[PDB]
Amino acid sequence: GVFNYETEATSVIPAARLFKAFILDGDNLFPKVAPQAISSVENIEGNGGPGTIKKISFPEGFPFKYVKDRVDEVDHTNFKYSYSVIEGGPVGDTLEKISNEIKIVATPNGGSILKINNKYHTKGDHEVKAEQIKASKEMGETLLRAVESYLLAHSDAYN
């Protein structure tokens, strides 16, 4: 079945620039700016569009070793990005996949709002949960804040 979760985050970075960095260049940026959260990102197959698979490894001591994420859709106009966790981490005999959607929207103050949807697809009926969601949200926030800090400090990046 499907467990649906929606949340929002804010940033002081304009939407297009944040999308370019946080979404389109995550394979480079996440291990660079958040090494205590992400050890490495490996492109396994594909050239960045639908179906591209990446292996994201976590540092030693983290609850999980890695996940494989698959790009589902990338909308460069509307700053929408869809991807699925398809292997590793919580995925296995009780959880088929986690399908995610992020939209980054401009705000008139010059910042942005991120609208985030996570859908957990279970095999049979096993409960997803609050602890799993909390961990996911915390990781997302850590990554967002690290990328934002980098973009504040490097004005010529993604500009």
Side-chain angles (χ1 to χ4, degrees), residues 1-102 104-128 130-159:
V2 173
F3 298 79
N4 183 50
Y5 304 92
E6 185 75 20
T7 192
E8 287 191 3
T10 68
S11 178
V12 299
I13 303 301
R17 183 168 182 239
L18 187 60
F19 189 79
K20 189 166 191 51
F22 184 64
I23 304 302
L24 299 178
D25 207 37
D27 295 7
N28 169 50
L29 275 181
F30 293 166
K32 175 195 302 204
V33 305
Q36 274 71 71
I38 305 291
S39 49
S40 67
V41 178
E42 186 182 3
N43 174 277
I44 301 296
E45 192 84 33
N47 202 202
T52 297
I53 296 163
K54 309 147 189 291
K55 180 175 178 179
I56 295 86
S57 295
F58 302 111
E60 185 169 27
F62 273 57
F64 301 128
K65 184 174 186 187
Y66 76 96
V67 291
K68 287 176 178 165
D69 289 353
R70 179 190 68 209
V71 176
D72 297 316
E73 290 181 330
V74 195
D75 181 344
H76 287 243
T77 296
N78 298 297
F79 314 139
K80 299 171 54 187
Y81 180 61
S82 293
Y83 72 97
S84 297
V85 179
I86 65 167
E87 195 191 293
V91 173
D93 57 15
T94 66
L95 179 69
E96 306 171 311
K97 69 173 176 183
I98 311 168
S99 61
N100 307 292
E101 300 174 340
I102 303 171
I104 309 187
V105 316
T107 61
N109 57 12
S112 57
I113 292 168
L114 300 86
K115 301 176 178 191
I116 299 143
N117 189 263
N118 310 122
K119 284 184 170 69
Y120 288 69
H121 292 254
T122 59
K123 296 184 165 182
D125 308 329
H126 290 66
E127 275 198 273
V128 174
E131 57 187 20
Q132 190 143 12
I133 305 313
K134 193 177 95 79
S136 177
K137 179 71 177 148
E138 288 171 346
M139 174 61 77
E141 180 73 8
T142 293
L143 295 174
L144 174 60
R145 294 300 158 224
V147 168
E148 177 175 76
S149 187
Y150 182 90
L151 296 174
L152 290 170
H154 296 83
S155 61
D156 296 328
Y158 307 100
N159 179 34

